[PDB]
Amino acid sequence: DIPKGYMDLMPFINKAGCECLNESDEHGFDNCLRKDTTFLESDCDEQLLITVAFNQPVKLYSMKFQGPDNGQGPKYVKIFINLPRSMDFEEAERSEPTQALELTEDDIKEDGIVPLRYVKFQNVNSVTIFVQSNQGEEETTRISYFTFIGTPVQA
Amino acid sequence: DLYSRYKKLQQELEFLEVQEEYIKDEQKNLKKEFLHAQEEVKRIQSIPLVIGQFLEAVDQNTAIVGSTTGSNYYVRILSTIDRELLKPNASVALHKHSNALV
Amino acid sequence: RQYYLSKIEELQLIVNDKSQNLRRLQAQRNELNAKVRL
Amino acid sequence: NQTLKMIKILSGEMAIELHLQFLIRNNNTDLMILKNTKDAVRNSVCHTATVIANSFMHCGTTSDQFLRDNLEWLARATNWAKFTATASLGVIHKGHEKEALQLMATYLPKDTSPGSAYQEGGGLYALGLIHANHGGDIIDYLLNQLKNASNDIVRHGGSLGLGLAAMGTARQDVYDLLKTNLYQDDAVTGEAAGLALGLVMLGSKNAQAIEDMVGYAQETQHEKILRGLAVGIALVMYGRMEEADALIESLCRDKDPILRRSGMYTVAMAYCGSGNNKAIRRLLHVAVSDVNDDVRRAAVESLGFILFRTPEQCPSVVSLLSESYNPHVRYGAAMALGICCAGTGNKEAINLLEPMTNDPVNYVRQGALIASALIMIQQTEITCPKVNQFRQLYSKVINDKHDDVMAKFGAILAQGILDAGGHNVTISLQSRTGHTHMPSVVGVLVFTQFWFWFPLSHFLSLAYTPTCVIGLNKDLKMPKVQYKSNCKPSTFAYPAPLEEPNFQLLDNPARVMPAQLKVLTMPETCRYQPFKPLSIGGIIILKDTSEDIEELVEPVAAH
Amino acid sequence: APAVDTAEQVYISSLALLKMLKHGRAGVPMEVMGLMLGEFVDDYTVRVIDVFAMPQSGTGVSVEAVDPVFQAKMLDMLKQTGRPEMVVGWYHSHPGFGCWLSGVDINTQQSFEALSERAVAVVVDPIQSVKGKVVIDAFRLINANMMVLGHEPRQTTSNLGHLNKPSIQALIHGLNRHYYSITINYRKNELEQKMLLNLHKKSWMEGLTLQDYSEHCKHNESVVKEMLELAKNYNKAVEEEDKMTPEQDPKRHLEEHVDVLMTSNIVQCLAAMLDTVVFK
């Protein structure tokens, strides 16, 4: 897939910065990271907060934020960038995101690629996703596959 | 004929008003710029300055001056200096980094 | 008819006066701009 | 049947073809001037200027003889210059739609140490230039090429070509493609994307396009995109007059100097030719008050677009800006006089420009030379006394080994402008009948942006309108007819190549200068009769008064 | 082959310029140096958002003056604060030597460019930066193969790269032969300018404080006496005007004294009476 001139940003992801809050121990953060049927599930409630850092600064164009069809796919996502400190759910709800995202149903499918405002993502070091709600309004949310499409800034 | 001349007169008058307002605004801004330029010229006369001897006047704005560092320099005379006060071997203060006869 | 002529002559004298005024303003601005440029 | 013929006329195919034939037939360019200039070029800047000047001289003549002769010298150009060179090709073949794709096939791509993506981008740009304002067919091809374009330079060239082709059509698909390219947020492609957004949605007053473009200009960080978007915002609000006012204020107050420059350009495009005194007041206030020199310059430039309908009033207002201490204001004054009195040969404007050609600041000299060329285009010694002198001046600046590089660049482009289109085209922001020629206004405005991007200079090719009187029969063909110009032949003659009766007979088509149009009638012995009075000029239908068989003017081939 | 455009600019932030000037002066007469942080936005832009000084070493300014521990720890802890900007380039001070790059300067700049092709080597003269003008330039390099082959170091596409003329002092020290000057633009937003405006923003008080009235009277006396002498000179000069066809002015000095008198006394009067009527 992916638009011409871009690449999957998987090899540029630094595992030292990755950190997901409210995840069930049985459903690890790597499940959403990996392109398998394995999924990441929130453990406390629907809200989730996943921070991913990169080895080198990168520029994002589109995200593949997809989950299952049972309605537990995300629906409202606040994206913050270059966070100098770990993110708190209270502030994340309060804070103004770099980009707000109302994930329609079609995004959650396997062919769902969500374009991002490339203007605001030109010096991304670490990207934090605050999943505020899910489609089915369940007590928890599942993410089948999450990744980023973009290009390195060639540091 | 008559109406065309009258309309041309009105258009010309309005354009004259526009030019007048333009010129007044530019006059104000030019006065500000002149003040800044005078400030800069005065600031170039700050301290320290190296003493030298006004050896010879070459042009209305350029002279040859013997700076007491022991060296002769062809430098530029500042306008505000009284020309009649510029006599040979007179002691003159020169800009430290440019030797301009300050 | 003659009303046209009265309006025309009044505007003509006004335009002449303002043209002299504009020329004077231009001379003043020119001298100030010359000072600034120098 | 006859309705199809008027459809053909309205689509522009017939008029463009006739203009192309007129330009080819009366190609009178002196290649010796270009030979001298190519002899006196040392650096790459003068090389690019020479390419552009040759393009201007042969604009629409399809005569690339200079390039074919000096291919070895042309190969010296690399990187963007090479791009510009290829782009220049499109100006030479202006209106040569029929073979365009095919002929661009002859300049087929290769692989070398430069990416040759400059060549592909220049090819797309030239394709757009050829079909400028008339891209009815090329649009789909350029859309496909831009969509499939991968390189950044190719994207830039394709965006420029697409904007030129789609100029004023305001099609939504092309706007979406160009907005996508703009959102890709690359400095090289940003200029082209913003300029093409302006070109496509030109004069449309669209709220969506303008909000997208202003928001992007306030959101991005690449200044090249800022300049492109500035000119684009100007173009979108072209000719809308007071409907621009809101936007204008929203751009005059903005903190970003490029956005303020966009506000000045929007004042120019919105009130182009109206002479609205509120616009002039605002422009003069900005030109004398603003803290960023580029904004002051652009503010002075916009005066030409405001006042081109009353050129006699233009030196009166710009003369004092001409002497201003600020060199940027001086350049703005020069090019404002150039735009304002373009193709008129105004005496006062040239007298104002004459001292400017010796200004200490180099780019001021460049602007003065460019503006003089714009003013005196097609002019002769009798019509304009000083023209010869300026001609010598140009050569001197080229042959002065110590003169600064941009003084030389201005001189080269001035030589190109003065003999544009084989001395068969002029710069007329007004139309023949008194309408604001929108392609001319857009082309001149974008040409003024050569200060920021040299390949944009070819946009001035839009302003080249042929000075012709094309007589047509009832069948729209061209009978062999002669018109009598009641003036001394040297009054409007071509310049003498480098090394009398009171009337002249001109064949069909006739290279008639706009001033010569007044004194031109047609002999009574002619079996035809002009339908519209000949003094107006342009493509004029001739009614045949006799049933004798017609002798048609044979169509000359290309190149 | 790609060529660096002559329109490329170095956008130095206000804070970066101030820190650079302060550090350059603080080390006079030694040559101090430090690292400029920022980002290469595009092919025509190099943004210097911030610059941190580096400890002085007896070496001087060389590629051995960048202590790896200092640089690494400073970068890490700035990133902690919120400034995760890459090392765009380096700066050092040539006190009174003008702006240029010496052989060792060219050497360290080669070292920096090996890290990233885009990298600037701005230098600042801290003693030539007298109030008003600021003597600072930014140079990258020219590849030797680029110059020997005869091709120009930088492609040109606009007049931006030639608005300013190179200096003779830089030119003899290798300018346009081994390194090219890059135009420098200062990124000053409204907020920073307004904050800097407080340096000489007088007060809400001195708009209302009258001059020392005895001092005011003495100043008036002195200026009026000077104006009397000037009036005598003006009369003497004007008498000469008659017996003189078109062929310091006691008048210009007279006008200046008049202007200073009217401004001083008008201001003093108005301030005094505003004070009388706003304070009961």
Ligand SMILES: [Zn+2]
């Ligand atoms: Zn050094």
